[PDB]
Write a protein that binds this ligand. Structure first.
Ligand code: CA
Ligand code: CA
Length: 279
């Protein structure tokens, strides 16, 4: 399949060179896989989700997304126009309030919930969890992310937007998950993106167009935008049978575009997510 005039992030992950505008992908498009979006919620009624998204858990008064952050990330995962895996199933877990904040104890409970909730969902091709959040270092938050990964879920987390080493931020500093940095359309490291040895992969993160609340769209930037690219790619590869939840992060790094990025400090991987699609 080919999506012409696609968002630059989608075209980048289906090309070995920057500057293209077509997203090449296999028609399976992640059908049979499931992706939990642990964020501010999802506006599941948005036409771009085609009825494939639903809220399953909230830790506040409502399950509605009153911020837009979670709706934006979920659209990058699997919306029709702006998504990597255009046929996956989306589940929303609202651990952040409508201001974009949340306590660590609530974020931990959300991860434990996903580990248990997947056992009563029909996801024959596997389960992915996308965490576009984080804060200061916390061993308890790292441990919860390691538990979710150990339970059989491919966990992708944002590296952070501090332009610093991600080793002082959680859950980005947990080695067993997949920590995602951000890049721009010129194959440069995003000026805000964290770095360090704990990073596993880079994804498109600057000026990312996706869905928004009120049935609209808008373009925002952050490592919170790069993570759903990797989460969507994992569901796309797992549906194709290329990898499993336990080894998806390693397979993505093994098959990524290598050396294409600039302004990468020494000690940080120079790897860019890539789907290796050949018609
Ligand atoms: Ca290249
Ligand atoms: Ca890792």
């Amino acid at each position: 399949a080919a999506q012409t005039n696609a968002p630059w992030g989608l075209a980048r992950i289906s090309s070995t060179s920057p500057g293209t505008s077509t997203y090449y992908y296999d028609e399976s498009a992640g059908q049979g896989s499931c992706v939990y979006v642990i964020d501010t919620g999802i506006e599941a009624s948005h036409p771009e989700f085609e009825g494939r998204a639903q809220m399953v858990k909230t830790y506040y008064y409502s399950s509605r997304d009153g911020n837009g952050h979670g709706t934006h990330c979920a659209g990058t995962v699997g919306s029709r126009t702006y998504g990597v895996a255009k046929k996956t199933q989306l589940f929303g877990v609202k651990v952040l309030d409508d201001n974009g904040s949340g306590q660590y104890s609530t974020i931990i409970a959300g991860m434990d919930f996903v580990a248990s909730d997947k056992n009563n969902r029909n996801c024959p091709k596997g389960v992915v969890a996308s965490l576009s959040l984080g804060g200061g270092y916390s061993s308890s938050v790292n441990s919860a992310a390691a538990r979710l990964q150990s339970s059989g879920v491919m966990v992708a987390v944002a590296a952070g937007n501090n332009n610093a080493d991600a080793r002082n931020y959680s859950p980005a500093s947990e080695p067993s998950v997949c920590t995602v940095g951000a890049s721009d359309r010129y194959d440069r490291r995003s000026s805000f993106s964290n770095y360090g040895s704990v990073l596993d992969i880079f994804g498109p993160g600057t000026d990312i167009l996706s869905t928004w609340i009120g049935g609209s769209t808008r373009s925002i930037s952050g490592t919170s935008m790069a993570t759903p690219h990797v989460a969507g790619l994992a569901a796309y590869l797992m549906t194709l049978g290329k990898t499993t939840a336990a080894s998806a992060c390693r397979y993505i790094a093994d098959t990524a575009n290598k050396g294409d990025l600039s302004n990468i400090p020494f000690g940080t991987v120079n790897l860019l997510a890539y789907n290796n699609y050949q018609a």
